[PDB]
Each structure stands twice: as C-alpha cells, then as structure tokens.
Design a protein around this nucleic acid. Structure first.
Lengths: 393, 150, 33
DNA sequence: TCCTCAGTCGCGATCGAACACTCGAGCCGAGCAGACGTGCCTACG
DNA sequence: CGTAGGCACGTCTGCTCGGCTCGAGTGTTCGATCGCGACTGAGGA
C-alpha cells in the first residue's frame, strides 16, 4: 500500500520540520489540511517504521520503551501541580529517541534520518548469475533512485539463498557505486544421494529436482526476506525457482510473491505448482485464495493448449461436492473457516476463464448456476450471506 | 560455567590502586567458577577465521582512526597504525588502506593517507557489525595458547 | 636452526644494490636525453 | 509307526554412513624493480 | 661572490612466485539389516 502510494504521488513525510514537502498539493503543517488518503498512509507508514525500529532494537527493549513512557505518564497523571509535571504525559520525537537510547544504549539516528526525515521508499532490481568455476553466486542489485517517489539506500541488505545444502542468510553492503555482489555457494551432494533438503525452519522435505539445473545448487533467492526496509523488489529468477519457492517455502510472503511472479510464466509446470498449492491444506489459506486467481490468469493465457476440463472445476468437485454426484454441491457446513473462504473464492476466480472466442465458457457458467440452485443452508450454524454474495460476484 | 558462591576470607580486602592513590573496598561474595562449557569456537593458528579476524580488526582500527581525524579531508598517519600493529608487515596495512585512502606525497596533506572523496566512511553500527568482542576474546585465547605451546 | 639458517649486513648489501641500480637508471636517462 | 510345521542359525548380498585422496580457489608473505618525493652536494654567470 | 643541475634514503606501487588452508568431489571400507536354505524340537495321522 505505501510503496504504491509513494510511487504514485511524492511521498509521506513523518516528522516534518517547520514547506518541507512541496511535491504534493496540500500543506502538511496541520492535520486539517491533509488529504484523507495521506492521513491513512501516514498512519500506515508510522507503524511500519516502528516495526523497523523493533528490527534494529529488539522487541523486549521496545516494550520497555513503551512501558517507560506509560510509567512517566502515570506518575505525571496523579500530581495536582498545574503542568509542572503534567507535560510528562506528552511525548515528543526527541524524548522518544532519548528513552530508546536510555533503555538500549544504541541510537537509531541513521534509521530515523533515512525512514522518517527523508520521505521515500526504495526500489530494488536484482538479477543473479551462478559462476560454476569458482562456485559463487554473483548477484546484481541496482536501484531506481531517479523516480519521483524514490530514495537511495546505502545500508546493509539481507538476502536468503536456498541451496541444496539448506537455507543460508547473507548480508550485503550496498554502497552507491556497488553493483555486483559475489556470495559463496555450498555443495550439491544432496543430488548425489537422495537426501532431504533442509528448509528455512528446522524441517526438511523431499523435492523433485528434475526441473533444477544440473550445475547450480541454488534453488531460490530472496532479496530482503524480513521486509527490513521500505522496499519494492523486482527479482529475476528462473521459473522453476519460483515454483520451488511456491511449493516448499515456509514463509507466506515468499509464497505470495512467487504466485505474483508465476503469472509471467504460463508453463504447465507452473499450473502444476499452483494446483498443488490449491489442493494442499496446511498451506495458509490466503495463499490458496491467491493461487485461484493466478491459476485463472495462467489458464486464460494457455488456451489452445489446455487439455482437460476448465481450471479448478474438477478440484472444486473433488473438494466441495458429493462423492456420488459431481455436479451437486454438498450442503453448506461452514465450520472449518478455511475451506469456507476457499469455497467462496474459487468460483469467483473460475468465472474469469475465457474461451478462444473471448467468451466465458458455458461449462463454468452452468457450474456456477448449479452452485446457486443446489445451495442448502438449513444445517450449518452460520449464515450464508457472504457465500451467496460471492456467487453473485 | 557452573559457579559456586563462597563467603570471603575474614582477612582479605580489595585495594584498587590508580595513579593518584590507593582505595579500599571490602568484599563479601566470591564465586568459584567450575570447568567452562565453551559456546564459541576458538580458531586455530593460520586458520581462515584467524586471518579474517586479523584483517577485520585492522580494518576496524583504521576506520576508527579516520573517524577520530579532525581534518576536513579525513587523514591519518601510517606510523600510528604501525605503533598499534607492529608485527604486521606494512604490505598488509597498505592493502587495507589501498581501498578507502590514498597517499599524498607533495603539497598539502603531504605524508598523510587522506580518505577518498567517493568513499563513504561506515557508520558506528556498521563498524560494530564488522568485529564482535567475543571474536577478539577467541583470537586472544588462540594467540596466548600459541605462545604457551611455543 | 642457525646451522640450517646458512641480517643488518644483508640489508646494507640491498641498499648498495639499490644505489647501483639507481645510478644505472640515471645513466640510462642520460643516454636517452 | 509316523508327518509335516513353527521358531531360529549361518551365510551371501546389497546398502548407507563414514573415511582417505585429490585438486583447485583464494589469500598472504617475501622479493624485486621502480617511481615520487625530500634533502645534500657541484659547474656556470 | 651567487646560483641552478646531479647523488642517497623513505615510502609507496605493482607484478611474480611459492606456500598454506579448506571445502567440493570422488573412490573405498565396513557394520547393518534382508533374504535363502537349513537346523531342530514339536503336537496331530
């Protein structure tokens, strides 16, 4: 939301100094002259910058800062002196930074100078190349700092590389003149023997390594995984790396960004990846709800190649319909709250299917109308208004 | 490491001497520390981690000498670094100064290593992220054990 | 060790070598000009 | 008199885990030739 | 008499070569089970 708004119009400036922001058509000196979208993005950027301050100075020290502010205010709140002490209930920026420096011993003045006083987000364009001879991974990260909303980042940058030997984090120092970052790569001895490949968490899984390159061990790369800067990343992986990142990652933002990047690769391996995500309980439900729409877009792009039925129809009849009647939907029992959301989002994406003539097929429209006719809600303890409203959608 | 609280002897006091005079405290609590269970790996001699720590320590010292410099083009002297690290060959010190500095022979700043104008000197938290104090303790343990074995 | 080790004198010899080389270089410069 | 039948021993048989050997990538020190300067000393006006 | 053109060190520059570590890659050994035929007591014809 904030990178869309700041690249759209100028930027949000937390803590201006009194104009400080002249790129935008109102004055930021008073709350009653702000646009309402600017007020909303102001609150949004403020809580993300506080998450960044928690990233630099750990969460228990952050809660100690907040407790110190509240405790000064509550010793202030019981005095009777007319504001000799009632102004300890008012916080400022300098007092907040001083309380942070009191509890932690680190000051955050570079982070405050970059993300508060400066009003911009950063844009990262990354591309890699694997050097087989020296066994290194040559990243190439360049910033677009000449757009109207952007600024230049010179700090450190975390990158997480999943190779066959596991998941390794690397810190890169991205100075102004930097372009190529050579990080080292590990072995490929988990392709010699079939062993399980260890993940970002402690677990390990069986991966189908037939799509991987023979010479490179690395399975996927993520630039800034923890969202530790206010950034927009445009990484150029290979399509099998996006499919491996969709399947076997233990991070929902990486699964979402792989869904978002698989729309450019309409190959049938990506259709298999999104269909395996859709069938998979123990995936987070908002990833499967995105995979519905991604599968609809991919299915629209590979018409005159699609083999069987329309997308997600057989999957809908496998998950939510009767075993004896495929075209009759099961009676509504909405007590699971994840297959309820997936059931009410799957025909909405299924209706975006189009034939070679650019008209929605009469197999999906008939399916949606049979979902509407055979709807029986006399048996669940929950209402049907959102599911029926999504059927109209 | 497991520690065990013992009371102090009744005769022993603690004298803190400085340049100005002697100062006396009593002590009442003294722990006995058992066999340590190490959580940090001491590097070996001529290891890759050993040479990496030596290079990073020299680089951190050079950056902090550049931060301490009051001259508007930040400039340091080589024999300050040669006083700090006298066992180092000067080729290694010049390797650390090659990037981030240049030698001025003539004119102003002569016989000084001025900081390059395009080089951004790292901030305090980056210099702290370069070398950790526990790595310095592991290096000191390695070189002390090197001396005792030698 | 000293039996297998077969120096301020060597440093002086190196200084003499550098002086000779510099004189030869100056002679080369004179020949060129 | 039988009459096969259930539980277990010895040996080949392959398999996973570890261990020894190789080979190159990369860094570090020494060494050497030389330049870029300061001081220290002579033929010409 | 003055006055500008040649000799020693100091510190840095740059290239070459040899040595050391360290991890990837590949081949070799050895216990750990799996299966087969057989041993050997055992309750019913």
């Amino acid at each position: 939301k904030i990178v869309a708004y700041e690249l759209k119009t100028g930027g949000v400036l937390l803590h201006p100094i009194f104009n400080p922001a002249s790129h935008l058509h109102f004055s930021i000196k008073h709350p009653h002259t702000l646009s309402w979208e600017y007020y909303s993005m102001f609150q949004c950027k403020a809580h993300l910058v506080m998450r960044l301050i928690e990233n630099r100075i750990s969460m228990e020290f952050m809660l100690q800062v907040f407790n110190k502010l509240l405790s000064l205010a509550s010793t202030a709140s019981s005095q009777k002196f007319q504001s000799h002490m009632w102004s300890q209930m008012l916080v400022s920026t300098s007092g907040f930074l001083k309380s942070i420096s009191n509890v932690s011993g680190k000051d955050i003045q570079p982070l405050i100078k970059q993300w508060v006083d400066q009003s911009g987000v950063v844009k990262f364009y990354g591309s890699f190349a694997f050097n087989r001879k020296r066994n290194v991974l040559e990243l190439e990260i360049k910033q677009d700092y000449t757009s109207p909303g952007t600024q230049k980042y010179v700090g450190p940058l975390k990158v997480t590389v999943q190779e066959l030997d596991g998941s390794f984090n690397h810190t890169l120092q991205i100075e102004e003149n930097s372009l190529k970052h050579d990080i080292p790569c590990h072995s490929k001895s988990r392709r010699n023997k079939k062993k399980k490949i260890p993940l970002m968490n402690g677990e390990e899984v069986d991966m189908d390594l037939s799509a991987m390159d023979a010479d490179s061990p690395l399975l996927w790369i993520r630039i800034d995984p923890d969202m530790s800067v206010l950034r927009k990343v445009e990484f150029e992986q290979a399509d099998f790396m996006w499919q491996y990142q969709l399947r076997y990652e233990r991070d929902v933002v990486a699964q979402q960004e792989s869904i978002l990047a698989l729309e450019k690769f309409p190959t049938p391996a990506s259709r298999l990846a999104l269909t395996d995500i859709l069938e998979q309980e123990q995936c987070f439900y908002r990833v499967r709800m995105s995979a519905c729409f991604c599968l609809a877009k991919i299915a629209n792009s590979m018409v005159s190649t699609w083999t069987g039925p329309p997308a997600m129809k057989s999957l809908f009849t496998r998950m939510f319909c009767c075993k004896s009647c495929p075209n009759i939907v099961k009676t509504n029992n909405f007590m699971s709250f994840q297959s309820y959301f997936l059931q009410k989002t799957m025909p909405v994406a299924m209706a975006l299917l189009r034939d070679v003539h650019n008209l929605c097929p009469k197999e999906v429209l008939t399916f949606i109308l049979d979902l509407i006719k055979y709807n029986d809600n006399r048996k669940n303890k929950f209402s049907d208004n959102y599911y029926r409203a999504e059927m109209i959608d | 490491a497991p520690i065990y609280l013992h009371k102090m002897p009744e005769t022993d006091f603690l004298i803190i001497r400085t340049r100005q005079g002697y100062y006396i405290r009593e002590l009442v609590d003294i722990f006995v520390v058992g066999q340590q269970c190490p959580l940090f790996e001491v590097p070996g001699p001529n290891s890759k981690r050993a040479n990496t720590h030596i290079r990073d320590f020299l680089q951190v010292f050079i950056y902090r000498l550049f931060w301490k410099s009051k001259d508007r083009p930040r400039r340091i002297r080589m024999e300050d670094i040669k006083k700090a690290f006298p066992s180092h060959s000067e080729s290694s010190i010049r390797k650390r100064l090659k990037l981030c500095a240049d030698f001025k022979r003539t004119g102003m700043d002569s016989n000084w290593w001025v900081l390059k104008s395009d080089f951004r000197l790292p901030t305090e938290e980056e210099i702290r992220a370069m070398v950790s104090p526990e790595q310095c303790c592991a290096y000191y343990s390695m070189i002390a054990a090197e001396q005792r074995l030698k | 060790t000293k039996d297998e080790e077969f120096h301020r004198e060597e440093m002086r010899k190196e200084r003499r070598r550098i002086q000779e080389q510099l004189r030869r270089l100056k002679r080369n410069q004179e020949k060129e000009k």
